[PDB]
């Protein structure tokens, strides 16, 4: 009975992704419909009164100094969509493109965009369908270009994408999705080509993916402890209280929960032990684990606090009106002209999250490096191989692949610092927020692949250490390994792992270990 | 018919690309065939004598301390390919994958790899067919992973690609291309899974693309001068002689040739003018052009010298034996163990070329920014629009798109500086040359799109300035615009340019303006 | 003191000798004659009132304002004034002098119009023990630093003594026996022009890299003597199979360093014939980890990058990067173009910076391996002496090396950051000066990492072979003994920061010979 998200004023990130991913239908609440009808009328009055407004009585960009007569507005807005459709590059994926449509709709729902009922209906119809507009990913400096392409698609003059990414031409899309062609006769084109919808859509998908990968990062760190006799005192709540960062407190708590019931971890607090004369000397192992285990709360915690900041800012952006111009619902003035379309907030938060993702991917990569090293994995086979050593190398190749993926992630930095004056110097500063969000997404995809490798390594390591029965392994750990084994067989002998790594990565981005 | 490249010892970059792109067939010269048969015999002896050799009687990586009985070599080498096949990500394009196969073949042709006649024939057959192995682009730290995937493909256990990128399953590929399944019964698997073949293949394709884009960069700078009354004295040979960088001298000479016959450029040497009291005052324009024209020889020249270095190093790498172990043709020792597989040379040259490409793309982007700015383009319409201003914005969107593409290029830096110790610390330093070459390729693709936008802008600007008949435009300039107009119509009214930009970019990467 | 006679061409070594004060500089008669001829040409250009940038026009976009001859002195005086907006730490003594030299070499070609007096001022500075105090930041690539240089030479700017101590303008002219710069001939553009700053910085970088490269080779070799490294990986036969010049050179130099050593493994593993009884797991693998086995390939790629950098820099140093320029053949009164665009030094500096970071990474991993008790084949953890635990040896220094490398990696190429400026007239800029400076910082970090590796190796060699260094090559023995003359063995933990810093300063100026 497909769930339904009723949009009034505010929608959270989970609800937004539910709609964007097609897991939920979207309906406009009565008060939203009324606010929008009132705004539609205000746009009508602005046109009727011949108010000096950008896009209604003026050209675009530096050409806004050219005033336009009412009889040429249809042509004015038609060419607006035309000159902006200069995008190139691979199309945004199905979910992301739909997230963009949703972002524009949420802004419009605030009742300050002047969008007609039909226009709103076209956006709602798309979201309730199984399709997404096919829009090029590159072209914007932060999001008129991708939105212009969206408009063309909705008019049947651009391709559509099905859940699998297969492309349909304009006519087929409108047909298969039972959609009506977009009509901009009300001169409300600026309600569709405006704001930060693309970067916001991309970022909300990033937020969802990071939540799941963060759960896997925690789950795998915990399982790693069960495979290497990790010490749980480093994850004690007392330490969190002494350094009260919310993300760290949460990370530690989640780690403790994962290993609850485990007989494979070391829970003894070393300071409890009293030493005598015969103890002085060299012990087989130090009283503390390497940082990839001991400092997991602190590293994961910092990443989680970054994601929390990213989500706070993104939630405001998603539910805001980033349009220009805007028509004040209070009727104070006919319209306001400013720069709420400047996507600097998503640009900076996306860049910050990208750095955090790279840091956490580094943690996972080092956890793989330690687990597969016979000199560091406390008795486990080199590279967790099965069968005769040498004749079999196990995950030796996959371990290097994880390193290669991480190295590539590091080569790309923040997008925000590259602003270049453009548009005849009119846009002398630009956010590049769309690019920032896209670069962050690529890093998230690499992180998923690294975590997938770590997951496959841990499933094997758990069985090598505790037997196929996973004796002593926590209930959470057992459930995770058993769940993986349902689709990924043990590595009893070397075999190509590339397709399995890719398949598992796709899963990690959409579901958590529960 | 079809040109033929006879491989003996040395092959230049153009020949290599000719074979990789399918433009030429390949044949092994008799002397090379004999050197390889001799090497094939040496491998046989080494195996019979049970010599201590990596991959023949030992495990891989840190597992090399595990000696292997001769009776298990077939299994040892089969699992080598298996554990290495952990690659992920989009497959290398048709031409690039074939360039990788060619790179491995050229190394083998030197006669120190021990490859059997059948093995060599399988590589030659692939290169002479219309197919390419479908290999994932990510996974190597620099190139066992991509080569292992290549081996699987050649055995019919992996997909193939046709010229269009459409995939064929293993069986279908061997069938269609009349290829025999790869047989490694001679224990010469290390002849196929070794060296720097992938990064070298990617780099040779990069080299070819840059040659063409460099020609377009020159041709478009020249046409820009014809559209903005550019001063040719800045491109004088006398200036080149004073600062003798080969690349600069070449760039200047090529620019002068492009505008030969033009009546649209300013050829007067300002210093010839004798001033008198009546001349003292403010003139309409300065006596020298802005840097995007005046310093073109110096900027383009520096990029050309970088490409020259890249090509010198790449030519040595392509024709070298990057195998390990190796079997000395002189027979001094049974085999040598070293590290000629370390791709640091291609890593550093690819990173250097990537920077040069970003710099030249910046030049093109600023040329677009100047040409489309009504305050800087000396009388041309804002954004080169046609039709009523305001109602039409011309290339206003495309100009911003060019800026967005450049900003994205700048976000990615050198890959070489991210070495991370891996393989249980055995590979404590890695080149990341494959990643370096791939990142350079992405920048080259962005540069092509920026140049495409500049070309479309210039075709329009030339007609706006000189009329549809291009009165006064140089013969070379006329030919370039006429050729563009054969496929790309004038912008009489605003229209979506995205698909045209993408289409032209594909052309620029493969052909030069002549 | 040796003398470098400048006529037309000077190599990088000669340039550094003069910049560092190791050699005097003299302008050869042919150069003096060419320069006098150019001085005469400038005089004629001025007399004839030819339309020339800086002589009859304003600057930058203001060049459209033509100037009357009677106002040229003010014109050129204000040129220096508006350009002196530099900020930041001053260039070091050697680098500032290298900049002065680069401008002089350009002038020596005879196309700048510089007067005999102006040339003498540059020569005098180079023959003195002083350097102009010029801010390092401000140029987009090198009018700003050169304008500051002019002010200094006129006694209106500070000078630096060899130690970096600053002297005011008046004191500088007095102590260095320098006459104040007089630009009455209207030859100011002969001094404020070209790519002199980035070129001077780059030539100092080139010299430093040659020495650090020699240390990288020497320490890799000593590392092999401390870890029983296998020399077959450095065989000439392998170089011939993959003929990169830098690699062949690196391998040959490595072999030379360990010649006479009894601590390395020279056996070719493939010589060994295996028996059924040998099948199993041996104590060690037949090949070394990459930090030793792939040294020729890694060092070699770095050396080939430096070779390219040096080829390009040699052309730049000996070129005329001035604008405008006065053709010696008299074909035209003057040429106007853009030879001041420092894109060549920008791109080569960025490429070298990447290579330096890669090589520093190699040294850092060599330290990480040598100090790891699980990887150093029997050596004490962190090469400590005295009771373990109570002593940690080089544990702190090892982490410091990692920290230095991580910092190097945070900074990338400077060339990709061009920004349209000067009212869009300078719509593309090279940033070559910044590129060269960022490369210098990386070189300084590399020196520190190598210093740590050197101190670790001196200790490791003594721990492995005894204080007498038994079995160690003559080259290795000489290196360790030289280090021990100033750096005592670590018998008990002690602060190493100042020693690391002191040794790093040495590595940048001298090689292990």
What is the SS3 assignment for A434-490? HHHHHHHHHHHHHHHHHHHHHHHHHHHHHHHHHCCCCCCCCHHHHHHHHHHHCCCCC
CB burial of residue A159 (10 Å; 0-12, 13-18, 19+) = middle
d(CA B173, CA B154): 9
Tokens found for residue C98: 């290298």
Decide: A192 and A150 in contact? Cβ < 8 Å: yes
d(CA A136, CA A146): 6
Q: Which residue of B has its CA nearest to A365?
A: B422
Tokens found for residue B310: 């890249």
Residue identified by tokens 């956010």 is A431
Q: Assign domain C1-194 one CATH number from 1.10.275.10, 3.40.630.30, 1.10.530.10, 3.40.190.10.
A: 1.10.275.10
Total number of residues shown for chain A: 514
Beta strands, E only, B14-133: 25-28, 88-91, 132-133
DSSP annotation string for A259-305: TTT-SSSB---GGGPPP-GGG-S--SS-SS--HHHHTHHHHHHHHHH
Tokens found for residue C248: 């062949």
Q: Assign domain B196-514 one CATH number from 3.40.50.300, 1.20.200.10, 1.20.140.10, 3.40.50.720.
A: 1.20.200.10
Residues in chain A that come right before a backbone break, where C and next N are over 2.5 Å apart: 142
Does the annotation mark B54 as catalytic?
yes
| Dihedral over alpha carbons C77, C79, C82, C85 (to 10 degrees) | -100
d(CA C427, CA C430): 10
Residues 6+ apart with CB under 8 A from B464: B380, B381, B384, B386
Residue identified by tokens 């801010």 is C135
By C-alpha distance, which of B441, B423, B275, B419 is closest to B358?
A: B441
| Residue of C374, C412, C424 lying closest to A375 (CB–CB) | C374
Residue identified by tokens 């040998």 is C278
Yes or no, beta carbons of B366 and C234 under 8 Å apart = no
Method: X-ray
Give the helix, strand, coil percentages of chain B, each rounded to 5: 55, 5, 35
CA angle (A290, A292, A298) in 5-degree steps:
110
3-state secondary structure of A492: coil
| Residue of B51, B345, B409 lying closest to C304 (CB–CB) | B345
Chain A residues whose CB is inside 8 A of the C388 CB are 282
DSSP state of B368: H
Reported structure resolution in angstroms: 1.5
CA-to-CA dists, residue B327 to B32, B336, B436, C252, C292, angstroms: 15, 6, 30, 21, 21
Residues 6+ apart with CB under 8 A from A333: none
Asked whether the bond before C324 is cis by omega within 30 degrees of 0, the reply is: yes
CA-to-CA dists, residue B403 to A160, B361, B453, angstroms: 27, 10, 11
Q: What radius of gyration, in Å, describes the C-alpha atoms of chain C?
A: 27
| Residue of A86, A399, A493 lying closest to B497 (CB–CB) | A86
* C293 marked as part of a ligand binding site: yes
Q: Which residue of B has its CA nearest to A73?
A: B391
d(CA C235, CA C254): 10
CB burial of residue B262 (10 Å; 0-12, 13-18, 19+) = buried
Decide: A159 and A134 in contact? Cβ < 8 Å: yes
For strands B4-7 and B25-28, give the pairing: parallel
Count of CB atoms situated within 10 Å of the CB of C320:
24
Inter-chain CB pairs, A–C, below 8 Å? 7
For strands A167-168 and A160-161, give the pairing: antiparallel
CB burial of residue C69 (10 Å; 0-12, 13-18, 19+) = middle
* B425 marked as part of a ligand binding site: yes
HSE (side-chain half, CA atoms, 13 Å) at A506: 7
Give the full edge-to-edge strand order of the sheet including A167-168.
Answer: A132-133, A160-161, A167-168
Residues 6+ apart with CB under 8 A from C162: C21, C93, C129
| Residue of C281, C374, C420 lying closest to A421 (CB–CB) | C420
Query: What is the H or E stretch that residue C87 is in?
Result: strand C87-90
Distance from CA of B298 to the nearest CA of C (A): 6
φ, ψ at C130 (rounded to 5°): -110, 165
Total number of residues shown for chain C: 513
* B17 marked as part of a ligand binding site: no
CA-to-CA dists, residue A429 to A313, A324, A342, A416, B406, angstroms: 21, 17, 9, 10, 15
Which long-range contacts (C-beta less than 8 Å, at least 24 apart) are formed by C121-125?
C121/C153, C121/C178, C121/C179, C121/C181, C123/C25, C123/C26, C123/C27, C124/C176, C124/C177, C124/C178, C124/C179, C125/C97, C125/C100, C125/C153, C125/C176, C125/C178
Inter-chain CB pairs, A–B, below 8 Å? 278
d(CA B59, CA A494): 13
* A294 marked as part of a ligand binding site: yes
Total number of residues shown for chain B: 514
CA-to-CA dists, residue A287 to A268, A465, B454, C382, angstroms: 10, 21, 64, 19
φ, ψ at C230 (rounded to 5°): -90, 115
3-state secondary structure of A389: strand
Q: Which residues pair with B422 in a beta bridge?
A: B427
Catalytic residue among B27, B33, B44, B54: B54
Which long-range contacts (C-beta less than 8 Å, at least 24 apart) are formed by C505-511?
C505/C447, C507/C211, C507/C212, C507/C215, C507/C447, C507/C450, C507/C451, C507/C454, C508/C208, C508/C211, C508/C212, C508/C443, C508/C444, C508/C447, C509/C208, C509/C211, C510/C211, C511/C210, C511/C211, C511/C214, C511/C215, C511/C218
Mutation pick from B210, B270, B276, B443 vs chain C, by most beta carbons of C within 10 Å, is B270
Decide: A434 and A146 in contact? Cβ < 8 Å: yes
Tell which CATH architecture fits domain C195-513: Up-down Bundle (1.20)
DSSP annotation string for C247-287: HHHHHHHHHHHTTT-SSSB---GGGPBP-GGG-SB-SS-SS
Decide: A108 and B467 in contact? Cβ < 8 Å: no
* B423 marked as part of a ligand binding site: yes
Q: Where are the domains of chain C?
A: 1-194, 195-513
Residues 6+ apart with CB under 8 A from B305: B245, B246, B247, B248, C312, C344, C347
Chain B residues whose CB is inside 8 A of the C297 CB are 339-340, 342, 344-345
Beta strands, E only, B129-225: 132-133, 136-138, 160-161, 167-168
d(CA A334, CA A153): 31
Decide: A316 and A111 in contact? Cβ < 8 Å: no
CA angle (B282, B285, B287) in 5-degree steps:
95
Q: Which residue of C has its CA nearest to B427?
A: C290
Domain A1-195 = CATH 3.30.70.1450: no
Chain A residues whose CB is inside 8 A of the C281 CB are 389
CB burial of residue B253 (10 Å; 0-12, 13-18, 19+) = middle
Mutation pick from B138, B140, B404 vs chain A, by most beta carbons of A within 10 Å, is B404
DSSP annotation string for A200-218: HHHHHHHHHHHHHHHHHHH
3-state secondary structure of A89: strand
* B294 marked as part of a ligand binding site: yes
| Residue of C66, C269, C296 lying closest to B281 (CB–CB) | C66
Which long-range contacts (C-beta less than 8 Å, at least 24 apart) are formed by B71-79?
B72/A388, B72/A391, B73/B47, B73/B187, B74/B185, B74/B187, B75/A391, B76/A390, B76/A391, B77/B184, B77/B187, B77/B189, B77/B190, B78/B184, B78/B189, B79/A391, B79/A392, B79/A393, B79/A493, B79/A494
Q: Which residue of C has its CA nearest to A374?
A: C374
Tokens found for residue A132: 């997404």
Yes or no, beta carbons of B422 and A405 under 8 Å apart = no
């Amino acid at each position: 009975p497909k769930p339904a998200v009723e949009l009034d004023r505010h929608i959270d990130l989970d609800q937004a992704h539910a709609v964007a991913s097609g897991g939920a239908r979207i309906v406009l609440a009565p008060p939203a419909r009324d606010r929008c009808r009132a705004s539609e009328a205000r746009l009508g009055a602005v046109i009727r009164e011949a108010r000096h407004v950008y896009g209604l009585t003026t050209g675009f960009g530096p050409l806004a100094n050219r005033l336009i007569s009412g009889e040429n507005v249809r042509t004015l807005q038609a060419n607006l969509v035309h000159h902006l459709a200069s995008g190139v590059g691979p199309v945004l994926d199905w979910t992301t493109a739909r997230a963009m449509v949703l972002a524009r709709l949420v802004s419009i729902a605030q009742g300050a965009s002047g969008a007609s009922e039909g226009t709103i209906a076209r956006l709602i119809d798309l979201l309730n369908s199984e399709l997404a507009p096919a829009v090029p990913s590159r072209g914007t400096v932060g999001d008129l270009t991708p939105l212009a392409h969206m408009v063309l698609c909705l008019q049947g003059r651009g391709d559509f994408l099905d859940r699998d990414g297969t492309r349909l031409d304009g006519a087929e899309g409108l047909r298969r999705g039972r959609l009506q062609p977009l009509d901009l006769s009300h001169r409300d084109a600026l309600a569709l080509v405006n704001g930060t919808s693309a970067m916001t859509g991309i970022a909300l998908v990033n937020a969802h993916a990071c939540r799941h990968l963060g759960n896997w990062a925690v789950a795998l760190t915990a399982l790693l402890a069960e495979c290497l006799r990790g010490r749980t005192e480093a994850w004690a709540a007392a330490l969190s209280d002494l350094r009260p960062h919310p993300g760290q407190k949460d990370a530690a708590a989640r780690l403790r929960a994962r290993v609850d019931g485990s007989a494979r971890v070391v829970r003894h607090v070393i300071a409890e032990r009293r030493l005598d004369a015969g103890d002085i000397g060299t012990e087989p192992e130090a009283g503390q684990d390497a940082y990839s285990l001991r400092c997991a709360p602190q590293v994961l915690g910092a990443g989680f606090d970054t994601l929390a900041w990213h989500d706070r800012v993104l939630t405001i952006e998603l539910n805001a009106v980033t349009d220009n111009p805007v028509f004040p619902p209070d009727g104070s003035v006919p319209a306001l002209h400013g720069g709420n379309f400047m996507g600097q907030h998503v640009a900076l938060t996306s860049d910050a999250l990208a750095t955090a993702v790279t840091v956490l991917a580094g943690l996972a990569e080092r956890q793989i490096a330690r687990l597969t090293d016979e000199r560091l994995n406390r008795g486990l086979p080199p590279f967790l191989h099965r069968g005769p050593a040498g004749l079999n190398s196990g995950f030796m190749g996959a371990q290097v692949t994880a390193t290669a993926l991480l190295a590539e992630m590091r080569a790309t930095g923040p997008a925000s610092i590259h602003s270049i004056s453009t548009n005849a110097a009119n846009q002398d500063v630009v956010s590049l927020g769309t690019i920032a969000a896209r670069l962050c997404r690529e890093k998230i995809d690499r992180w998923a692949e690294i975590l997938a490798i770590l997951a496959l390594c841990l499933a094997q390591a758990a069985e090598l250490r505790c037997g196929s029965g996973l004796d002593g392994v926590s209930p959470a750990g057992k459930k995770l390994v058993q769940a993986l084994r349902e689709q990924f067989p043990p590595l009893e002998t070397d075999r190509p792992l590339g397709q399995e790594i890719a398949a598992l990565a796709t899963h990690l981005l959409q579901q958590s270990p529960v």
